[PDB]
Tab-separated table of C-alpha atoms and ligand atoms in Angstrom:
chain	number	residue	atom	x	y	z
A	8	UNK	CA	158.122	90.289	-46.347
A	9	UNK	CA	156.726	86.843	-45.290
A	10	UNK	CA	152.488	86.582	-44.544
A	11	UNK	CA	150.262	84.386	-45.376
A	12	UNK	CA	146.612	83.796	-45.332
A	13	UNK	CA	144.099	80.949	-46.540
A	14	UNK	CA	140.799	79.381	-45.792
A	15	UNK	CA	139.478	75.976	-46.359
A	16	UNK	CA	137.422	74.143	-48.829
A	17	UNK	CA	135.424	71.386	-48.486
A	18	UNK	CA	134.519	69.134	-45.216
A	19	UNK	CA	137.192	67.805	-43.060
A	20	UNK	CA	137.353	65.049	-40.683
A	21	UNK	CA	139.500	62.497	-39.049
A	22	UNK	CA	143.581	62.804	-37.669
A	23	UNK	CA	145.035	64.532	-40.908
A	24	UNK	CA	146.776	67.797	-41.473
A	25	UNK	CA	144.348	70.517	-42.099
A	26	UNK	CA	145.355	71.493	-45.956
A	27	UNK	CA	143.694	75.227	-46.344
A	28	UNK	CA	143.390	74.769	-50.050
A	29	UNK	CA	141.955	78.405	-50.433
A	30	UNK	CA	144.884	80.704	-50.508
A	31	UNK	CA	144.360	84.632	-50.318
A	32	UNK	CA	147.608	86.062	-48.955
A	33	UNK	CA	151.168	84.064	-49.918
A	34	UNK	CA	154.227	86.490	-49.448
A	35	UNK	CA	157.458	84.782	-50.574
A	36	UNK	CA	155.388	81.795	-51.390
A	37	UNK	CA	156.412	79.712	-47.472
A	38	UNK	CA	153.098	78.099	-47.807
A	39	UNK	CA	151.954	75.159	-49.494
A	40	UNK	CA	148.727	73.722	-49.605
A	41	UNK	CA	149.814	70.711	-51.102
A	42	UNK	CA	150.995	69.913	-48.164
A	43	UNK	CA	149.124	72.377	-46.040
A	44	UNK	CA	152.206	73.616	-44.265
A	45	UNK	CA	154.517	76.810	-43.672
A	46	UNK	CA	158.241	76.464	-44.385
A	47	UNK	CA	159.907	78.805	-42.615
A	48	UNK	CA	162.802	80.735	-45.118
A	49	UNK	CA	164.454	82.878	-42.558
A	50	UNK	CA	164.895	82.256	-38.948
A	51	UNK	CA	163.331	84.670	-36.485
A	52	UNK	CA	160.080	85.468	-34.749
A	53	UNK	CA	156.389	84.298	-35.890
A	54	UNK	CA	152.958	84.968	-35.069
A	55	UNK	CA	150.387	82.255	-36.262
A	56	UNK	CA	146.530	81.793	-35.769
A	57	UNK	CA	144.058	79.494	-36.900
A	58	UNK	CA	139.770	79.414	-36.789
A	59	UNK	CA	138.477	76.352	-37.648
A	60	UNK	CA	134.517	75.817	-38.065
A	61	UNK	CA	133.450	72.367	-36.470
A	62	UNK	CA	129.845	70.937	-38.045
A	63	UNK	CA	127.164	69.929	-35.095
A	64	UNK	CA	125.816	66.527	-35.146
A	65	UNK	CA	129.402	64.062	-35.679
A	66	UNK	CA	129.627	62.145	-32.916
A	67	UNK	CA	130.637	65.626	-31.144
A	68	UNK	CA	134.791	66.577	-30.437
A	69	UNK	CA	136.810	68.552	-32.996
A	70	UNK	CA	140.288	68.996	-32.201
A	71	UNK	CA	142.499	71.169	-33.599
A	72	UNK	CA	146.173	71.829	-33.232
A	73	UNK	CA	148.912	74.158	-34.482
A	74	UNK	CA	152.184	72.320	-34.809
A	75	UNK	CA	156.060	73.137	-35.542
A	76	UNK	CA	156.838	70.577	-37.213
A	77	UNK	CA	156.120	67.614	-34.939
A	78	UNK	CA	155.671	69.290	-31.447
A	79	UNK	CA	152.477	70.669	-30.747
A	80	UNK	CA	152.569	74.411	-29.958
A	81	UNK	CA	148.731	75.114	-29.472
A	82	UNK	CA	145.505	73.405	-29.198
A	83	UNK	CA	141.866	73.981	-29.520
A	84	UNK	CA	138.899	71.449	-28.981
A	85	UNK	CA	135.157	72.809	-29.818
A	86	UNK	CA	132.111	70.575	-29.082
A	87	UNK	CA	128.106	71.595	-29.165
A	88	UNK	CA	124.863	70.519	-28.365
A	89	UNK	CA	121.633	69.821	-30.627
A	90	UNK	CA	122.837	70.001	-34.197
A	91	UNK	CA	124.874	72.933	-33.665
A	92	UNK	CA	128.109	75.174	-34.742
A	93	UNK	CA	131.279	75.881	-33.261
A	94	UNK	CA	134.837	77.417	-33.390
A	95	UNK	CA	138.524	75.621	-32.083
A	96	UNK	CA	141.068	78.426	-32.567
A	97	UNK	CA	144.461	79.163	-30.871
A	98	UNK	CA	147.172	81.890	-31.600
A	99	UNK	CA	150.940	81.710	-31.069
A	100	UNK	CA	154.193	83.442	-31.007
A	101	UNK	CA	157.078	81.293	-32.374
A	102	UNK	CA	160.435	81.649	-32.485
A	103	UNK	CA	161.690	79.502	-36.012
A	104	UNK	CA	164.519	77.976	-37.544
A	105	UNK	CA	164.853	77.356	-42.006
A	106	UNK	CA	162.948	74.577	-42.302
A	107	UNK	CA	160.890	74.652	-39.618
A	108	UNK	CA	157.208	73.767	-40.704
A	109	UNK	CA	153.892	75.252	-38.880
A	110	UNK	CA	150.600	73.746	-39.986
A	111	UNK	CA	147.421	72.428	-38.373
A	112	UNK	CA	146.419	69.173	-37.197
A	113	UNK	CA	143.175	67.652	-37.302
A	114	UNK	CA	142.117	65.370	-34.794
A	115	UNK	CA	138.657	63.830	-35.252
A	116	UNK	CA	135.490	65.528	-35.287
A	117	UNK	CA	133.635	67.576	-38.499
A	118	UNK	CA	135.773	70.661	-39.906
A	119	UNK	CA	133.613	72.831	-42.367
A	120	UNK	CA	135.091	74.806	-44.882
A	121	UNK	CA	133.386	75.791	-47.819
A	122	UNK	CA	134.297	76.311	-51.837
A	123	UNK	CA	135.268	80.024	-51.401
A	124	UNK	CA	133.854	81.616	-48.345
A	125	UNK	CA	136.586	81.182	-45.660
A	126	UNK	CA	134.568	80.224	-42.202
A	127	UNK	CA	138.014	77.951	-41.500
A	128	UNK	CA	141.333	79.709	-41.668
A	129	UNK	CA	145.258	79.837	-41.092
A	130	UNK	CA	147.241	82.321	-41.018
A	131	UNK	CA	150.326	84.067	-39.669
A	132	UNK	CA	153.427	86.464	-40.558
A	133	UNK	CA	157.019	87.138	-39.538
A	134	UNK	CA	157.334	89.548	-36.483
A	135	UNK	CA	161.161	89.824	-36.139
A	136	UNK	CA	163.751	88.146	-38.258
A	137	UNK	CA	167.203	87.250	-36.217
B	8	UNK	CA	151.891	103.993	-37.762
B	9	UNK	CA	148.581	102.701	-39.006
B	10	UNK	CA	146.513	100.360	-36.004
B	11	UNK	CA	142.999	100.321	-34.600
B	12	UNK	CA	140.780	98.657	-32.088
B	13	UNK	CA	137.112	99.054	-31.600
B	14	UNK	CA	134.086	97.444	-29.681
B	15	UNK	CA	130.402	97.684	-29.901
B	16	UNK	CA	128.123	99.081	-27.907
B	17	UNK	CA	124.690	98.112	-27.758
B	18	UNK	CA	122.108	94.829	-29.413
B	19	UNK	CA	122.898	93.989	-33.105
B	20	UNK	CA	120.489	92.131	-35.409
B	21	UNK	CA	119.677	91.684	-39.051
B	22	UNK	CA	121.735	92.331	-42.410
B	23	UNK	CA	123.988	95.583	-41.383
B	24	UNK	CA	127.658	96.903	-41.578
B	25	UNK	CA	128.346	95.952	-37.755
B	26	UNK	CA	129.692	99.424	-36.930
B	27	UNK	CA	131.715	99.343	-33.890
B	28	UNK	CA	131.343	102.859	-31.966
B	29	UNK	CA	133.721	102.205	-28.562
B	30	UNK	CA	137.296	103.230	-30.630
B	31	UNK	CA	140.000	102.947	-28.263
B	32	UNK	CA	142.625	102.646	-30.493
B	33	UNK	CA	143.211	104.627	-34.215
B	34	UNK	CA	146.208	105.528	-34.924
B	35	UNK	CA	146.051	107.851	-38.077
B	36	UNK	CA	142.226	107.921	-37.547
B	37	UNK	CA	141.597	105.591	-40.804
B	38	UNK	CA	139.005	103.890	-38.786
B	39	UNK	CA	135.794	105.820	-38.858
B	40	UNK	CA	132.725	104.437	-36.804
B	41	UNK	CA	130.301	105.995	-38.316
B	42	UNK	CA	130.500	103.794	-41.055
B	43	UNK	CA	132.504	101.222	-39.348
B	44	UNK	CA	134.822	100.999	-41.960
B	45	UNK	CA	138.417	101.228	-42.014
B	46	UNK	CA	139.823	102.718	-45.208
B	47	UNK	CA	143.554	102.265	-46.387
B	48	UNK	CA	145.425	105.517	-47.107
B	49	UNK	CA	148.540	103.148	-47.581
B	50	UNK	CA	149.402	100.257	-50.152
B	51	UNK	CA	150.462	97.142	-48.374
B	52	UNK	CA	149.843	94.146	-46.256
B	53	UNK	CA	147.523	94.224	-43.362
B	54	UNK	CA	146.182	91.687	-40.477
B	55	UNK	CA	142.459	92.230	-39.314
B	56	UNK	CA	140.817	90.556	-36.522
B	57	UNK	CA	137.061	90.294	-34.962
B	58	UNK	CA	135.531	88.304	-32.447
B	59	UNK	CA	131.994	88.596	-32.177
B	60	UNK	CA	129.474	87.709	-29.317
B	61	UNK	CA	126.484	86.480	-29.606
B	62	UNK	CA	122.948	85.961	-27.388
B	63	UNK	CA	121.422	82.894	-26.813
B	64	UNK	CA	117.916	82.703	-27.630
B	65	UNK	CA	117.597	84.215	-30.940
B	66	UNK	CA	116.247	81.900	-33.326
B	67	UNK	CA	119.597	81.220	-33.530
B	68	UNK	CA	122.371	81.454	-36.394
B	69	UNK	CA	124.453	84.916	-36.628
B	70	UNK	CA	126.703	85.575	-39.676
B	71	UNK	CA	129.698	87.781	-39.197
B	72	UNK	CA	132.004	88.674	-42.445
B	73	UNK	CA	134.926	90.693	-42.815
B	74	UNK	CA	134.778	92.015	-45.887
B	75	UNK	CA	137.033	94.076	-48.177
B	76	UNK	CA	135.025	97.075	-50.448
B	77	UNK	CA	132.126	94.354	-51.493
B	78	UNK	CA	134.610	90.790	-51.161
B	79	UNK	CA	134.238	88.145	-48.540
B	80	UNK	CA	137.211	87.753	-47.377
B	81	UNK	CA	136.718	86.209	-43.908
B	82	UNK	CA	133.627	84.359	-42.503
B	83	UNK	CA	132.322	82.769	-38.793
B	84	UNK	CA	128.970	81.955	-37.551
B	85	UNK	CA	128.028	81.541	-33.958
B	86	UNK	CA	124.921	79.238	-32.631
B	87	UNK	CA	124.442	78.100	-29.606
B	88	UNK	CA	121.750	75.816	-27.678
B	89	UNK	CA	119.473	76.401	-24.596
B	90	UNK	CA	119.788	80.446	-23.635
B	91	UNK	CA	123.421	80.556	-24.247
B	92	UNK	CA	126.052	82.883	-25.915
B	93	UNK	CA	129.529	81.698	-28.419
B	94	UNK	CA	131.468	83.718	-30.920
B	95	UNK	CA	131.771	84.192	-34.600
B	96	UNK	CA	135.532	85.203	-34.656
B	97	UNK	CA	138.142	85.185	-37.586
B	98	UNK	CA	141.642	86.683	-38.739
B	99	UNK	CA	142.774	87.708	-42.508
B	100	UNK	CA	145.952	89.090	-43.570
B	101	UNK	CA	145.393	91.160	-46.984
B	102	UNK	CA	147.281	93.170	-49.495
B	103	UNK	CA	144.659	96.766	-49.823
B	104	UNK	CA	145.347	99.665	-52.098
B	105	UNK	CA	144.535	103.361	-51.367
B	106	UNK	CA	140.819	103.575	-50.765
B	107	UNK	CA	139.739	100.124	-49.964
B	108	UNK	CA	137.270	99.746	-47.287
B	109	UNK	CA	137.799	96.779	-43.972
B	110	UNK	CA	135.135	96.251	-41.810
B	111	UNK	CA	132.434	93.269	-40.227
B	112	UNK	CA	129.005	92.686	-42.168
B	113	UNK	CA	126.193	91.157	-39.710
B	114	UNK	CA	124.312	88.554	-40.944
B	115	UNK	CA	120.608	88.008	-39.285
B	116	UNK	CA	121.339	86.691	-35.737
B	117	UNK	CA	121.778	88.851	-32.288
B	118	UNK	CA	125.288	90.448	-31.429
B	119	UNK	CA	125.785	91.749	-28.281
B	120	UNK	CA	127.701	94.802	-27.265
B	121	UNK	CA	128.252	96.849	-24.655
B	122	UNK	CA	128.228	100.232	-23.616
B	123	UNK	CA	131.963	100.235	-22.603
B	124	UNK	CA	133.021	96.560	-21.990
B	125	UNK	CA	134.161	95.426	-25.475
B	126	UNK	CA	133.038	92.155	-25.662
B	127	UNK	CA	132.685	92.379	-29.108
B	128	UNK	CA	135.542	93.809	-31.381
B	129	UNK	CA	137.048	94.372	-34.296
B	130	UNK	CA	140.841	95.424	-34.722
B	131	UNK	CA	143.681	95.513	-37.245
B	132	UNK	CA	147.319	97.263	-38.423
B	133	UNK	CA	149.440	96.979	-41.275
B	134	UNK	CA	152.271	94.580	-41.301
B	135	UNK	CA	153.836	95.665	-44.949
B	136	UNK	CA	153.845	99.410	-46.919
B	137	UNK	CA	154.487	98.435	-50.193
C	8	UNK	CA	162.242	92.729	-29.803
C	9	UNK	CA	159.295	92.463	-27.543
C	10	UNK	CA	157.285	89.125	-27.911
C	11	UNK	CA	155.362	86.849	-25.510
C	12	UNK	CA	153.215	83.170	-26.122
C	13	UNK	CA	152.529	81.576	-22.627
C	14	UNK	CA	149.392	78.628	-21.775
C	15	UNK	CA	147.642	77.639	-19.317
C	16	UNK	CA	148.621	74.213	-17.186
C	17	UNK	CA	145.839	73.672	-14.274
C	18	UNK	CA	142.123	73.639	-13.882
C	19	UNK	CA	141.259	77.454	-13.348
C	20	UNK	CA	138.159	79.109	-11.228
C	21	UNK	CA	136.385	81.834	-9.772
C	22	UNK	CA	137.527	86.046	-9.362
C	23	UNK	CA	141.442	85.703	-10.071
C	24	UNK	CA	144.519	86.812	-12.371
C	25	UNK	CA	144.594	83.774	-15.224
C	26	UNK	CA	148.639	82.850	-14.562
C	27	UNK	CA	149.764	81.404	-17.985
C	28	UNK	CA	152.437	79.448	-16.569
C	29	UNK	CA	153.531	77.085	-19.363
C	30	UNK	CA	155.616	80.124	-20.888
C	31	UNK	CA	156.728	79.079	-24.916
C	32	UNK	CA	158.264	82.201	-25.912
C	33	UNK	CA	159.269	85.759	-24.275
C	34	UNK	CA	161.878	88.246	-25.588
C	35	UNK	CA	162.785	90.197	-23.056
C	36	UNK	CA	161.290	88.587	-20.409
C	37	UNK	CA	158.614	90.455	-20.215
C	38	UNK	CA	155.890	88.297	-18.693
C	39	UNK	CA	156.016	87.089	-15.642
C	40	UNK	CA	154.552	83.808	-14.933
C	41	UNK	CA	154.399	84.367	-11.114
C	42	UNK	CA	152.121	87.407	-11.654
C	43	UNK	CA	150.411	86.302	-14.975
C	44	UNK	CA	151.210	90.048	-16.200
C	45	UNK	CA	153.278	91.543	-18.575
C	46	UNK	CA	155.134	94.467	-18.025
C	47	UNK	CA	155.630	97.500	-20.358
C	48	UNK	CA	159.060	98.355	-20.896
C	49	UNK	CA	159.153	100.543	-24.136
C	50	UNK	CA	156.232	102.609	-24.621
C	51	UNK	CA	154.528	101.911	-27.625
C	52	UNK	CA	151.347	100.053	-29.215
C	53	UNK	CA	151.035	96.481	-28.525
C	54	UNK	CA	149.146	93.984	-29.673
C	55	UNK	CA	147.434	91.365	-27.127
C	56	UNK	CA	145.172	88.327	-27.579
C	57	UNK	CA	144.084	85.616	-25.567
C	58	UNK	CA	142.182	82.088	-25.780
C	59	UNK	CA	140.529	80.678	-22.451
C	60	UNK	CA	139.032	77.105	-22.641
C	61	UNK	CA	135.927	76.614	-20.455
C	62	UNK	CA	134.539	73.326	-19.317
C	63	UNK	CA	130.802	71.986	-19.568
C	64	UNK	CA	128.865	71.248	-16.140
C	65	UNK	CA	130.523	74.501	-14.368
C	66	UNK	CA	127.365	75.862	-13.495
C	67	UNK	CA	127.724	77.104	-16.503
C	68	UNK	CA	129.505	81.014	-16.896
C	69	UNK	CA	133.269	81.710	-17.459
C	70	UNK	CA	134.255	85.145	-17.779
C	71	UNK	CA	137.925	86.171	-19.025
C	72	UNK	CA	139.213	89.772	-19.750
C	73	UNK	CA	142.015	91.586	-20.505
C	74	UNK	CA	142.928	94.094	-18.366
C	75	UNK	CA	145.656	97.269	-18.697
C	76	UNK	CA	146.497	97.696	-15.085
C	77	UNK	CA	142.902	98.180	-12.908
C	78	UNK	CA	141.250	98.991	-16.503
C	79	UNK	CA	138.901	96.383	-18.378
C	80	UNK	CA	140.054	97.024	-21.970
C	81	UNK	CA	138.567	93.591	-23.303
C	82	UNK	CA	135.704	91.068	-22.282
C	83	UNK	CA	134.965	87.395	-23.343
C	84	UNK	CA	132.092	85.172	-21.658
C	85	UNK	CA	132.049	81.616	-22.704
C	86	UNK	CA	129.297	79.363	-21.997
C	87	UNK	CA	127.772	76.096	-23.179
C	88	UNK	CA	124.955	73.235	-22.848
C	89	UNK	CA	125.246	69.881	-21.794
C	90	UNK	CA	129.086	68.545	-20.635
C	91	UNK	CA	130.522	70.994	-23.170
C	92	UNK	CA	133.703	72.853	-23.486
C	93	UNK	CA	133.661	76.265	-25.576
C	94	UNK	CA	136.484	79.243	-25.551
C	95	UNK	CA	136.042	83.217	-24.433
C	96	UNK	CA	138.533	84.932	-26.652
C	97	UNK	CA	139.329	88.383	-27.858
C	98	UNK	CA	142.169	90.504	-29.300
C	99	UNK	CA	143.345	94.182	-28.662
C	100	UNK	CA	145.988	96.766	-29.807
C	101	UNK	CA	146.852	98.802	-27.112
C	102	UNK	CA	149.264	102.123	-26.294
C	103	UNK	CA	150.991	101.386	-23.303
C	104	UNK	CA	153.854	103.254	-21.364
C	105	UNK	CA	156.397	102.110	-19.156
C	106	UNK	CA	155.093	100.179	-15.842
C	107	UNK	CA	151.688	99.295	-17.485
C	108	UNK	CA	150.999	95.763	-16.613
C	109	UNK	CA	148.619	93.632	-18.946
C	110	UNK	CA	146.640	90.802	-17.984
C	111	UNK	CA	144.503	88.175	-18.317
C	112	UNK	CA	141.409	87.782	-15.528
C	113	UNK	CA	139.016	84.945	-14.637
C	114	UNK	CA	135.729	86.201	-13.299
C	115	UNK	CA	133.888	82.916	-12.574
C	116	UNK	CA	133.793	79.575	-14.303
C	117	UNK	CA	135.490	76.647	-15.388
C	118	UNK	CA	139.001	77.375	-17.009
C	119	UNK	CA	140.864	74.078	-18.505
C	120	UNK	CA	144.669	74.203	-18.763
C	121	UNK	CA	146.938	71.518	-19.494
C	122	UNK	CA	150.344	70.783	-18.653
C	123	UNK	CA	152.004	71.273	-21.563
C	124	UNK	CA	149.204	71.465	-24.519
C	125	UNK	CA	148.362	74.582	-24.410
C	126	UNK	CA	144.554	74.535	-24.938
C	127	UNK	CA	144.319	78.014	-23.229
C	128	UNK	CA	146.611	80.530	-24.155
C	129	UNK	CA	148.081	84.747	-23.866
C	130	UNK	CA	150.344	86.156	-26.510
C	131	UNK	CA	151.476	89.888	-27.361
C	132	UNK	CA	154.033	91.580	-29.173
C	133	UNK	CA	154.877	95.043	-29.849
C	134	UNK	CA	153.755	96.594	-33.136
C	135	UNK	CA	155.307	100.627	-32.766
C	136	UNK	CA	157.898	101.891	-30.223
C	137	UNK	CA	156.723	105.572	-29.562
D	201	LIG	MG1	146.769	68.319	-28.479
D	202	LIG	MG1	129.677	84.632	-45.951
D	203	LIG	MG1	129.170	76.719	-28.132
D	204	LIG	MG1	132.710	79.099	-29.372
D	205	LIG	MG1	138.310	82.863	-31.336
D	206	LIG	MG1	134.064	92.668	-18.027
């Protein structure tokens, strides 16, 4: 039984792994927000997605990617206008090897999360195990 | 076999349980729109999605929560400049016991839905009986 | 094991099928690239989501849905101010039987897709095999 499920905390910005500090769901324990990432235990088939809340006025490009260990799998970019609000999210379907971590990336631009209220998130669960 | 997916049908606005009335899928019929809540008959681990449209033009800030019984669990706001329409969309994967009660709060703002188009929805299965 | 993750590689516009060429994973090749559909093999329920990148200064109106053969079973508009990119997403679980095809279509607008990053993508899996 591997899921997981957590949100994050305070305001993010910058290249830096996204560390959702705010965990809800945790099955076998795979992720760390220490480090922010998912260690995959057994090898099979994954599905991952991510929502990450992007703050308007800050300069104005928020990337965000979901990465397996160093390649990235999926990306998301979310931009606005006047002083406004804004969502880069992506999904994916991985197959994974033990050891294999899956975490977001962010690249520049103003990620909002807040103390306990989950507007950013990351998320996934096993599918099929080989 | 426990899975649903809903939309919404018509204008949304103001502090309400965003009930979504266009069921397509409800497998074990544990999603009732009346309420638009879905209510666990099983003990174990389940994913939950929404995405959320809203109108431009509007004041404009909309609040969308998933929430389990009377917990946050998920948040997303949508805003958007001159006339124009984004989403407040996020994903959870929680552990529910017998009787606890999924579904989207609206918070002030205008969600849009249609008759029979779904471009507003709200979905979800279990992954894990415990 | 039925499982798909394919993204998007070229700029995208007007009434078409959304081809998600840049195919990451696909047990039982099941989606076909050269159609952008995927094909039903086992009847069951399956879950589908999608995430379609739209580029500012496009007029500005992208419409992508999902569609189960001629049938619109999901709808996303995206749509922003000045220069700006936003996505039209949604999610579905679906019963499908054998021959059903499942799609993503562009009605309109600006879709971005990149070579290999994946900033617009389709996924599925299968959740229950009838
Ligand atoms: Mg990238
Ligand atoms: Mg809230
Ligand atoms: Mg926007
Ligand atoms: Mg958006
Ligand atoms: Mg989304
Ligand atoms: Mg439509």
């Amino acid at each position: 039984k591997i899921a997981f499920y957590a949100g994050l905390k305070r305001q993010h910005e910058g290249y830096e792994v996204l560390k959702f500090d705010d965990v809800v769901t945790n099955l076998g324990n795979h992720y760390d927000p220490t480090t922010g990432k998912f260690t995959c235990s057994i090898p099979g088939i994954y599905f991952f997605t991510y929502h990450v809340l992007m703050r308007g006025g800050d300069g104005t490009s928020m990337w965000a990617d979901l990465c397996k260990n160093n390649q990235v799998r999926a990306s998301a970019i979310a931009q606005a206008a006047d002083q406004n609000y804004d969502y880069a999210s992506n999904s994916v379907v991985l197959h994974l090897e033990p050891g294999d971590e899956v975490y977001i990336k962010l690249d520049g631009g103003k990620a909002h999360g807040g103390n306990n209220n989950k507007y950013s998130t990351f998320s996934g669960f096993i599918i099929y195990a080989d």
